[PDB]
Each structure stands twice: as C-alpha cells, then as structure tokens.
Design a binder for this molecule. Structure first.
Ligand SMILES: O=c1[nH]cnc2c1ncn2[C@@H]1O[C@H](COP(=O)(O)O)[C@@H](O)[C@H]1O
Ligand SMILES: O=c1[nH]cnc2c1ncn2[C@@H]1O[C@H](COP(=O)(O)O)[C@@H](O)[C@H]1O
Ligand SMILES: O=c1[nH]cnc2c1ncn2[C@@H]1O[C@H](COP(=O)(O)O)[C@@H](O)[C@H]1O
Ligand SMILES: [Mg+2]
Lengths: 430, 431
C-alpha cells in the first residue's frame, strides 16, 4: 500500500552525537543508506575492524559494498571536497565506491566561492560585531542562500549544456563579487575543474525522486536515512541564528528526499550521554571547568570537520524533550556512556529557570536562553570501566539507572547504549 | 494514540491556481485550527460564500470561520504591511474580529520592505541582462528565505524583544542588502517606525508555535487543517527550478513549517485542476496555444487577478500529477473546475512523456529536457452538458464520471471531491 517505510537516525542535540555509529550498525543489512540535508560541514567517524573512516558527504553505509549509498536533493555538494573525501578514504581501503554511490540530480552545488564568502562573512561579523556564527566555513549557508535565490546551480545543470552552465556559473560568480568586492574568483580555472567533475559524476547521477519512489514501492527494501547536524542546529527549530542552514529535523527527510510522511518508519534520536556544541551560541549546561575538560578530553571532543575544540556540559533534558516534540522519536540511542565511567556524581539538566522561575518550554529567542539558570538532578556515578560491556547485564547498577533515567524522563525507549568507539561497543537493548 | 491527533493537509498538485481556497474553506467549516505552514503572502486563495468572494494571501482562508483559530507557522515569511493591508480589504467585506482568532508563531521570519524592493530590482536586473527573469510576484519572498538561510534574517520573536537591539540588527541587515544593490533606497528610520507600530499591534497574537501546535494535537481532540500555498511544481526543491517559489510547498514543508513529526500528519489532499495552467516562461508539455487554450483561459478566468496577465493553459498532464503524488503521497484528491470542460466535444490528456524516441518513466528535473519532451495523449469523449448544478455523483453524466475515474485510475489516488463551481456549495463529495 504505502510501500516500505524508511528508518531514520537523527541528532537530538547540537550534533556529534554519534549518528555515524548508529547508522553504520543499522547499515550492515540495509539496501539503501541515504543522505538528507546539509553538506560536508557534517563530519562523522566510523570505526570498523580497528579501522577509522571520516565521512562528511558520503553516507556512512558507503562502507557496505552490498548497499547503495544515496545523496538526496536536499544536500548541497562541493565537488572538489566530495572526491577529496572519497580518495582520502580509498587510501584506507574504500574500494569501488563510485560504483555504489547515487546522487539525486536535484542536489545543489557548493562552489569554491561559496566557501570563500562563508569565511569572508564570518571574518566580517567577527570584526564588526566582535562575534560570528562559528560556521565550518564550508560555504553551506551561502549555497542555501543561492538556492533560495534560485540563482544557485544544481547537479542536473552541471551535466546539462556546459556553455549554458558556464554562463550561469559566471553570472552567479559576479553577483557574489558585488556584495563582496574583495572576493577573488578564478572563473576560468573553476569552470575548467567543474567540466572535469561533470564527467566523473555523470554515471552516478539519477532522477532522485524516481529513484526513491521505485525503491519504496517495488519489492520490500530496507532504506536508511542518515541525519546530519542536529535538532538544535535546525534552521527553523534550532538556536537561531547559531544554527546550520538546513532542516536537520525529521521534516528534512521528506523535503530532502521527496518522500511522503507515511513512508517514514522508525526515527531514532541519537543522544550523547553528555552535551556538546562546537561553534557560537547559548549552551545552558556548559561546563567551563575541571568537569568540562574531563568530558572534552575523555570524549575526544574535537570537530572532525574543523578540529575545533568542542564545548562540553551535562546532559540537558530541556533540549532533548524539545527535539522529541519536533522529531517524534520512536527510540533512542544513548552514546558515549563510558566517558562518565570516572565521575562520582553526574548532573543532568531537568528544567531552565529565568529569574528564579521555570519557563514552560524551549524559548525561540536564543538570548533568553543565555540568562536561564539550569535546574539539575544529581545522580550517582558508577566509577567503573564499561568499555568492555556487550550486554545490558554487564553494566553496573548505577550505569543502568542512568540509562533508565533518560528513558523515563523522555518517555522514549533507549534501544542502544554506546560504551565504546567500535561497532561491537554498541549494546542492543531490544 | 499517545502520538496525538493528526492534521489534514490541502496541497496544490500542479503549478498553482488549482482552486485551493475553495477546498480549504469547505474543510474548515468544522476545523478547530486552520493554518499556513510555508511561503509568503502570494497564496491568492479564493473563497466564495454567501455571495461574497474573499481573497487570502498570507492569512489562512479559514480566518473566515469565527469558530476557528487561524495559525501562521514558523516556516512562513511575513510582510507586516501586507498582512494588515490584506486584513483590511477583507474587513470592509464583512470580516470582523479577525485579530482575535489569529495566532502567529514566534519563530516565523520577517519580510522587510527592502526585501520586496530587492526582489523587484533583481528581477529588473536579470530581465535586462539575460533577456528574461524568474517571474516572481515581487513580494520579497525569495530574498527573505535567502536571508533566513544566511541567518541574517530577523524573526517575530526578535521584533517583540528589545526594540533597540532589533533596530541594531535591522540596520545591519539593511546595509548588507544595499551592497548587493547600491541602487537600493531604504528609509531605515521610517521603516523602523512602522515596524515598531506593527510589533505592538501583532504582540497579543504571537506565541510559541512549536508548543502551541503540540498542545493542540495532544490535549482534548481537535481537528487541525493545514493550508498549503503555491504548488508541487513551484516547490523550491521539486518544482521546475528556477521557475519556483522559495519554500517547500510539498507535504514535508508541513513538518518543517509547524514543527510536527510525520505521525501527526493524516489525510493529505491534492487539489487537481481538470486542466493545466502555468504562469511565466518555461516548459509546459501540454500547453495549447490555440482555440482550445483560449477556451480554457476564458471559461476558467485564468488571469492574474491584479496584473491581468493571462495564464498559459493546456490539457491535464498526468506526468506532473504522478510526480506530485510521488512527493506528496496524497491520500485523496479534489478534482476542480470540471465545469470548465462542460462544453468540449472531446478532451485530451497527457499520459506519458517521450524523449529522443522512448518513453521516460520520470518527470525531468532539467528545463531543457522538459522542453524537449514529446507528449502521448489519450482522447476522451466530452459530456457536452452543464454540470454546474451537480451535487451528487449520480448527477454527473457518463462521460464526466468517466473523466473522474480516468484521473483516479491513472494517478492511483481516489477522488474525494469534484468541483463544478467557485461557490462552496458547488461541490460533490464521493465518499
Ligand atoms: O556536524 C556538525 N557537528 C557539529 N556542529 C556542526 C555540524 N555541522 C554544523 N555545525 C554547526 O552549525 C553551525 C553553522 O555552521 P555551518 O553548518 O557550517 O553553516 C556552526 O555552529 C557549526 O559548528
Ligand atoms: O470548481 C470550480 N470551478 C470553477 N472555478 C473554480 C472552482 N473552484 C475554484 N474556482 C476558482 O478558481 C480560482 C483559483 O482558485 P484558488 O486556488 O483558490 O486561487 C478562483 O477564482 C476560484 O473561485
Ligand atoms: O500567478 C501565479 N500563479 C502561479 N505561479 C506563479 C504566479 N506568479 C508567479 N508564479 C511562479 O512562482 C514563482 C515564484 O515566485 P515568488 O513566490 O513570488 O518568489 C515564479 O518564479 C513563477 O514561476
Ligand atoms: Mg488565487
């Protein structure tokens, strides 16, 4: 009737929750593993067989040779970066990837100048207002602005008449040089490279809408959708303007792939045992102290895309319940629980107080979020190493209580618990 | 159940102007909440009840129901001057206390006057540079969504907070646009004065939309209707780019526009016009540049209600419909303007597309390919009869019923309503 329903993995915080780990796991027997929104500003690390892979644009299931990796229409692609990412992983064993990667011809293109303007605008905001967004400078925002302006160019444009394309590229090139006179654009060189890219990508392009429709209404197939960024980075629902420029929430799956809501099955909310965010913006449970350094250090909290040190803090339920209100999580994945193995006590934010009084819901004005005072509940730590745990019973009593604590306050079941970096580290609960 | 009640959605399945105002109004009669989830004030939905004819652009067409709350979601871009100007025109038509039943989400973005000016300027520029433009409605929708993506745009909540800080932000956003167009004239001070006034006037209507909708869907049972603006082929992602609007007017936009997950989406109705209309330059496979096209244009009153520009007309095109279904997953359809076909001896219908020589099983994303497609038509006999008074499926002659089935069968979606007139009573429910 409605066909197959896709399985979705979404970030429930400010990203870096370990989505690639849940996806790689769910990907072992998936037919299609796809990318939604965003671009290579996203950065995941997959650990399979004591082997580490850094992915940005490639769906994590690219490691599965029996599965087809798909990039949807909502994604913005930077060609030089795409192949750069792929080749970087070939050196690690990634083979025959081009033969199992499909790209929707409606995806927009991130050009080199889009990346430069991104940095330029950032430097501008940091020199004029003394405070910028903390973008990854990958040109994601500028690319989505062009998309909204309908001046941007897409995969299908690239594979179409090159003369027409070139003409459009040039027009788009000058426009950015108008609002940004100090922007340098080697138009001839970029076009030359792009023409080379056109042929390397031609065989991998397909009409995306038709591709997915056919996979969902033909014989049963397991389709997995990898979310990028996270709920609180969502352009609409995040801590605007300190967010990414795409919808990282469930709605983004429908708009990024061309599938209706009835073709969405399980939606997993990836929740890191503690909270982090890299970039500018309000962070209520942020711990800028000894505890903060400990989480950061033990969690190897560094952006894989930029390398910047991530800000760390306690789990925050306010943002998790908000994320759930928008995403409607069917189940949760609690990752990096082992990072807390050495804490005698573990605090978790349960509500935000403003001038001494609890606010009823997550605020739209991120500034108010800067003045709130977090109400914490202090749970007992387990002070034991859980990295070797492979089943629920291997977890000490207090670690188990922590898991249940989240499960009970969310009203959503925890299906996986991460105690390591390897695919085996995950603990399936049901 | 724990999931909550589900919302009903009405979407355009072609290139707009399908007759959505009528379907929305009909479904609103007993709706607790009627809302807009995406787009700006260029909906142009038409409602005809009790002799009166209402036009809505930014306001939900259910604003007419004094028993329901009209809601503007977070995915919407709002031009305050246009909003109240739209409300007043209708007010003088009998609409009253609308401000008392209009709720606005505090995360919705603001379309500023300079955003509108830039739309026009870029259009004039592009016009006399590439020979042709995008053909926007010049309501600043594109530039506003452009600002949203850049994260330099301002929102309702920003307008209601410290005005001084708001002012500081506005000025920066204002100057930024003056760089793109050093021809852009902006009375910064005046525009801020008018905005200060709009803020105090809109203040009592604003609320946190995410929470408001959540509560509406999880408390005592309520029926929420979602009014889609524009249409599938105008969708920023799935439409005939670049001749599209800058929002997701497809079903997903409902989730991203109101902040509700897929389990809260129920019936999704696709408004299908009995024939096809397109506005502006661009590929139109079934276009009829002849007497038949003239006939459709005249009988369907297909023309810019304001600018007066005539709309391009052609036969029904099942290729765009199936494509719109693949994206939207319609649960039922509203087949509109069947009456316009009352006089034809026969009706053609595009059933498939043929390229260089073989049929293409998909709707092309590129304008050049879509411009090259060969259309295979199916000729159906007309009913040659006035169906204006029809009110039961049994009132429609054989060839009309046959035409309704054709659409149903070829799209794979059942037809729930058949429209034969502008008025609310000019409908036929089939189930
Ligand atoms: O995957 C990610 N992990 C963490 N933060 C991210 C990720 N992608 C984007 N962001 C944040 O999103 C904001 C906007 O950056 P942009 O997406 O590069 O425009 C910044 O604060 C980034 O740090
Ligand atoms: O079934 C119908 N027959 C004829 N005209 C209709 C029908 N339904 C709606 N219309 C008209 O179609 C036009 C476009 O509708 P809109 O999509 O609400 O703007 C309006 O002028 C409506 O009054
Ligand atoms: O009257 C109309 N009916 C249907 N589509 C329209 C009309 N006017 C403009 N459009 C299309 O809508 C697109 C987006 O315009 P915008 O929503 O004003 O940004 C334009 O590029 C046109 O292709
Ligand atoms: Mg209209």
């Amino acid at each position: 009737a409605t066909g197959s329903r896709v399985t979705v993995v979404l970030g429930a915080q400010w990203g870096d929750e370990g989505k690639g780990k849940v996806v790689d796991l769910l990907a072992t027997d998936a037919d299609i593993v796809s990318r939604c929104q965003g671009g290579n500003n996203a950065g995941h690390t997959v650990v399979v067989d004591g082997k580490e892979y850094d992915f940005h644009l490639l769906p994590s299931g690219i490691i599965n040779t029996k599965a087809v990796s798909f990039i949807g229409n909502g994604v913005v692609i930077h060609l030089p970066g795409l192949f750069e990412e792929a080749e970087k992983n070939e050196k690690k064993g990634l083979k025959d990837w081009e033969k199992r990667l499909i790209i929707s011809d409606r995806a927009h293109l991130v050009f080199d100048f889009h990346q430069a303007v991104d940095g330029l605008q950032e430097v501008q905001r940091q020199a004029q207002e003394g405070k910028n967004i903390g973008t990854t400078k990958k040109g994601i925002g500028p690319t989505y602005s062009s998309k909204a302006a309908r001046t941007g160019l897409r995969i299908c444009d690239l594979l179409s008449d090159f003369d027409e394309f070139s003409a459009r590229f040039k027009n788009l090139a000058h426009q950015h040089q108008s609002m940004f006179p100090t922007l340098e654009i080697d138009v001839e060189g970029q076009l030359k490279r792009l023409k080379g890219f056109a042929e390397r990508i031609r065989p991998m392009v397909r009409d995306g809408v038709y591709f997915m429709y056919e996979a969902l209404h033909g014989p049963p197939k397991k389709v997995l959708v990898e979310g990028a960024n996270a709920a609180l980075l969502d352009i609409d629902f995040g801590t605007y303007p300190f967010v990414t420029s795409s919808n990282c929430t469930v709605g983004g799956v429908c708009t990024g792939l061309g599938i209706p809501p009835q073709n969405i099955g399980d939606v997993y909310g990836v929740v890191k045992a503690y909270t982090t965010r890299v970039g500018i913006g309000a962070f209520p449970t942020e711990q800028i102290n000894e505890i903060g350094d400990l989480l950061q250090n033990r969690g190897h909290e560094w952006g894989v895309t930029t390398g910047r040190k991530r800000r760390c803090g306690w789990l925050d339920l306010m943002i998790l319940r908000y994320a759930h209100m928008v995403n409607g999580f069917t189940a949760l994945a609690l990752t990096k629980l082992d990072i807390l193995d050495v804490l005698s006590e573990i605090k978790v934010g349960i509500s935000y107080k403003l001038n001494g009084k609890r606010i009823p819901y997550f605020p739209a004005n991120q500034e108010i979020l800067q003045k709130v005072e977090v109400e914490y509940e202090t749970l007992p730590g387990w002070k034991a190493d859980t990295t070797g745990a492979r089943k629920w019973e291997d977890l000490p009593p207090q670690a188990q209580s922590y898991v249940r604590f989240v499960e009970n306050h969310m009203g959503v079941a925890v299906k996986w618990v991460g105690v390591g970096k390897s695919r085996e580290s995950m603990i399936q609960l049901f």
